[PDB]
Ligand binder design. Sequence first.
Ligand SMILES: Nc1ncnc2c1ncn2[C@@H]1O[C@H](COP(=O)(O)OP(=O)(O)NP(=O)(O)O)[C@@H](O)[C@H]1O
Ligand SMILES: Nc1ncnc2c1ncn2[C@@H]1O[C@H](COP(=O)(O)OP(=O)(O)NP(=O)(O)O)[C@@H](O)[C@H]1O
Ligand SMILES: O=C1CCCN[C@@H]1CCCn1cnc2cc(F)c(Cl)cc2c1=O
Ligand SMILES: O=C1CCCN[C@@H]1CCCn1cnc2cc(F)c(Cl)cc2c1=O
Ligand SMILES: [Cl-]
Ligand SMILES: [Mg+2]
Ligand SMILES: [Mg+2]
Ligand SMILES: [Mg+2]
Ligand SMILES: [Mg+2]
Lengths: 479, 476
Amino acid sequence: MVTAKKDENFSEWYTQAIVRSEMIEYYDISGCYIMRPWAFHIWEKVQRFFDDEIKKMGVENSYFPMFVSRHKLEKGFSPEVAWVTHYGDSPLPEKIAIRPTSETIMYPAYAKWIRSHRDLPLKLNQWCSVVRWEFKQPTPFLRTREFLWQEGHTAHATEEEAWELVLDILELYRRWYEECLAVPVIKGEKSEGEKFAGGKKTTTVEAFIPENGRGIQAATSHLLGTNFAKMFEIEFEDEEGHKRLVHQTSWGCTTRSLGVMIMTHGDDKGLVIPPRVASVQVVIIPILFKDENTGEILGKCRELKTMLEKADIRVRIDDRSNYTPGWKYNHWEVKGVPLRLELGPKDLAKGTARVVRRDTGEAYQISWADLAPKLLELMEGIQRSLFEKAKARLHEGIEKISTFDEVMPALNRKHLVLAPWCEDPESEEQIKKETQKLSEIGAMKTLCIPFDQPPMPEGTKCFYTGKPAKRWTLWGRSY
Amino acid sequence: MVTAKKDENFSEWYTQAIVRSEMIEYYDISGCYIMRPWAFHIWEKVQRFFDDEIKKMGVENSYFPMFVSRHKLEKGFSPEVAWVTHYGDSPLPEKIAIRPTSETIMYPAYAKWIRSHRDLPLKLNQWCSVVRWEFKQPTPFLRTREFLWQEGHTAHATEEEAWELVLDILELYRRWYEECLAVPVIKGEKSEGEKFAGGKKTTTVEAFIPENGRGIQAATSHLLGTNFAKMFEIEFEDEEGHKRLVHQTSWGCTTRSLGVMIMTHGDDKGLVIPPRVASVQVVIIPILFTGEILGKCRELKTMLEKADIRVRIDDRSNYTPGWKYNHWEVKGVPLRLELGPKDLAKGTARVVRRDTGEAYQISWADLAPKLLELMEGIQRSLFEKAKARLHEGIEKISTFDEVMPALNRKHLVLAPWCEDPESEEQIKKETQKLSEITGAMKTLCIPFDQPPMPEGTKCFYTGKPAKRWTLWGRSY
Ligand SMILES: Nc1ncnc2c1ncn2[C@@H]1O[C@H](COP(=O)(O)OP(=O)(O)NP(=O)(O)O)[C@@H](O)[C@H]1O
Ligand SMILES: Nc1ncnc2c1ncn2[C@@H]1O[C@H](COP(=O)(O)OP(=O)(O)NP(=O)(O)O)[C@@H](O)[C@H]1O
Ligand SMILES: O=C1CCCN[C@@H]1CCCn1cnc2cc(F)c(Cl)cc2c1=O
Ligand SMILES: O=C1CCCN[C@@H]1CCCn1cnc2cc(F)c(Cl)cc2c1=O
Ligand SMILES: [Cl-]
Ligand SMILES: [Mg+2]
Ligand SMILES: [Mg+2]
Ligand SMILES: [Mg+2]
Ligand SMILES: [Mg+2]
C-alpha cells in the first residue's frame, strides 16, 4: 500500500504510486522504464481514441525506419542524439542515428511523393518510440530517454488548410486529456522563444501540477509554414501550372499523458483511474470466510458480471483463492479501479451488493436490478467529478497579475502567472535569468499565450518592460 | 504498370509490385524500407486480429525498453547486434544494444515479479520493432534489418499448461495466415538442428513460395522448458512451500507475413489483396473524362459503408477510367465498381473482381449483399488456389536419389527421416555441393499432419528405421 503522502514528499508519493499499482518497473538503463500491463492498457485506450479520431480526418498510419544516416540528420539538439556505431565488433562504414523525431526521415520521401495538387493534402501519422538522451532529470512517463508517441506530419496546398488541421489536431489533444483522462488543459500559442524553431507557429495544450507548481506541455501542434518545404524541396504544381511550396504541420503527444493523469487524480491511497480509460471499471470481490456459502456467492458474481457487460461495463471478478478479501480491497484500490463491488453472505440474502467508489470512498447499497444503470451513473459521476475538481485546482493555481513584483511571491505559492506582456525577444530570457537569480536564495518561462484572452484595457503596460502590452501570457516553473 | 512476369523474373516482379502499388518506399539505410499506408493498413489488420485473440487468452500487453546493457545481453548471434556507443559527442560508460529480441530485457523482470504459485501463469506480449544486422541479402518484408513484430513470453507452473499455450498460439498463427491473409501453412515441429537452442521444443508454421521453390518460416512458437528459468533464476514457491522452476513459452511473428501474402496471391498485373485485410475492398470508378455520376457514387459509397465495406471513390481529374482500372489492379483492390452514364441510365453497376477478372451486372439495391458474397468468394478462392499450389509443390519421396530432381522442379520434399542430428548436417552439405554443380536443402519441419508410415519404412538417407516424415526444401 502507498504510505508517502501526496502533499508531503511529492516525488516519493509518485514513485510509490506507480510502482505499487504495478504500472512501472525500474530498469538498469537510466531514464528508461518498463511499462507493465496496468499502465500499458491505459495507453491503449487513449491510443485507440486518438487513432480513431485522426482516421475520420483522412490521416493514414505508416511506419518509417528508426534509423537516419549521419549526413541526413546533420542538415541545440545535437547532445540528445543516440548514435549506433557498430554491429557486433564491426564498425559501421558510417555511424547511424536512432530517431529523436522523424522530419529528416519522412521529408525526403515527401519531396519524392508530392508532384501536383492531386497529391495533396498528404496526411500521415506513426505510432512508434523515439530516443532522446535527455539532460534533465528523468521521470517515469513525463520525461524518459525512450518514449512512446505518435507523430503526425501533413502537407497541404494552402496555409489556411494546414492551419485548420493544426487546430483540429489540437482540439483532439484537448479531448485526449479532458475527455479521456479528465485532465484540464489550456490551449495556447508558444512564444517566439519556446516555439519549434523549424516552424511558423507552435500551438500547445498545457497542464498544471499543483503539488510542485509546475506547468507541463501536454501535447503540441505546429503550423510549419513552408520552411521545411524549401529545405527538402517539397513542391507541387498548382491548378495553373506553376511550382508552389507545400504548407506543412506536425504534431505529437506521448506517454507523458499518463504521468499527467496519475499526478492529477491520484490520492494518498494511490491511483485513481478515470472510468473512460480504466481497463477494469468494476471489480467484483466475493467475500469468503469459514466456508460460508462459497458456491452461491461465486454463482451470483458470474451472473452479475454478464448483466453488467450487456451495458458495456468492463468488469473483473477477482475470484483468486490465494488472497484475502481485504488484500483484494487494498490491491484494486492502489490500482485505482473506479468501483469495487463487494458480495458476502449478508448481501446475498438481501438481493443487494455494496459498492464503493474509489474517488471519494462513498459506499452504496444497491439492488441487483438497479446495478447497471446505477453503476453507469456513478461512472459518469466519477469521470465528471475528477475533471471538475482538477479544473478548480487548475484555476486556484493561476494568478492574474500586473507587475513583476507580483511574480516571485506567486511562484512561492506554487502558482503560475497570467500577466500582460509585450512579446519581444529579449524579455523572456531576461525574465528567466532574473527569476533564476532570485529563486536561488528555479526559472520561470512562458508556458503559452492562451487562445482565450481576457480583455486588455487600453494603455495597459507589459509587466516587466513597462512598454505597451499586447496579450496575456501564462508563465511559471515547468517540466 | 507491372511489366516483369511473375513466373519468369520473380525478383523483379516482387520489387515492381511492392513499389508500384505504393506499399514500400526505398531507403538509404540497407535492409530498411518505408512502409506506406497501403502496406501498413494490412499490418494493422493482422495486429488487431492477433491482439484480440491473445487478449481472450489472458495475455496482456506491455512495453519493455528497446535498450539492453552489454552486461545483461551477454549473460552465434553476436554479429547481428547493433550497438549504441555515444550520445551526441559524449561516449557512454558502456555500449548499449538495440533489442534483437527481448529475453535478456524481460526475464530478469520475470525473476523479480514471480515469487509464488499464485503469481502464475504470467502472460505478456509486446508489439515493437526489433533490429538485427542480417548477414543475408535484405528483402522487403521477408528479411529486413529493422522489422515490426509481436513477441509473447509466458511462464507457467507446469509443462503441460505451457505446452497447451504453445499450441494455442500456433493455432493463432495459422489463423493469422490462413484466415486473414489467405495463405496456407503447415504446422510442424522443428528438428534439433533448427529449433531455438534456448528451448526444449520449437513449433512452427511453414509456407511455400512456388515461383522460387523455397520454404519459409511463417511464425514460431517455443516450449522453452525450464532452462531460462534456471538461467535467470525464475522460481516460485509451490503450495507446499517448495522452490520450483517456471515452465515457459515464447513466440513471435513479423511483417514477413505481409511479404508471404504478396507473393502468394500476386499475378502479372500486380498485387491481389485478400478482402479481409485490404485498406480498400471496393474502389468505385466513375466513367468520366455535372454531379450526376459523382452524386450517385457518393450515394453508393454511403450504402456500402453501412454494410462495413471499405470503399474509396477514385474521382481524380486528369486520368482516364482505363488508367484508373490499371492503377487499382496493381494495388490489388479486390473489387472494382464501374459507374458510367449507361449504368446511371439503367440503375445498375458493373463489378469486376480482381482475382479472376469476372464481371457482374448488379442492381443498386443488390450491391451490398452481392459484394459481401463476392468478397467471401474471393477470400476463399485465393486460399483454396494457394492451398492447391502448396500441395502440388510437395513431392513425397523414399530415397536420396529423388532429392535433386525434386529440388530442380522447385518443389519441397517430404521424406521419411530417422531424425538423427548429424544426418541433417550431412544432407545440408551433400545438397549444397550437388547444387553447385542458398542451394542447400534443410529441414523445414516435422508436420503434425503425418502421412501414413508403412511398417518397416527406412530413412531416405541413412537407411535406418524411419520415425516420421520430415518436410525439407531450399528456404529463406
Ligand atoms: N523526454 C520526453 N519524454 C516523454 N514525453 C516527452 C519527452 N519530451 C517531450 N515529450 C512530449 O512530446 C511532446 C512533443 O515533443 P517535442 O515537441 O519534440 O518536445 P520538446 O520540444 O523536446 N519539449 P522540451 O524537451 O520540454 O524542451 C512534448 O510537448 C511533450 O509533451
Ligand atoms: N530479418 C527479419 N525480418 C523480419 N522478420 C524476420 C526476420 N528474420 C526472421 N523473421 C521472422 O520472425 C520470426 C521469429 O524470429 P526468430 O524465430 O527469432 O528468427 P530466426 O530464428 O533468427 N530465423 P532465421 O534468421 O531465418 O535463422 C521468424 O520465424 C521469422 O518468420
Ligand atoms: O513537436 C514536435 C514533435 C514531433 C514532430 N516534430 C516536432 C518538433 C520536434 C522538435 N525536436 C525535439 N527534440 C529533438 C531532439 C533531437 F535530438 C533532434 Cl535531432 C531534433 C529534435 C527536434 O527537432
Ligand atoms: O524465436 C524467437 C523470436 C521471438 C521470441 N524470442 C525467440 C528467440 C529468438 C532467437 N533469436 C534470433 N535472433 C537473435 C539475434 C541476436 F542478435 C541475438 Cl543476441 C539473439 C537472437 C535470438 O535469440
Ligand atoms: Cl482499447
Ligand atoms: Mg526536448
Ligand atoms: Mg524547450
Ligand atoms: Mg535470424
Ligand atoms: Mg535459423
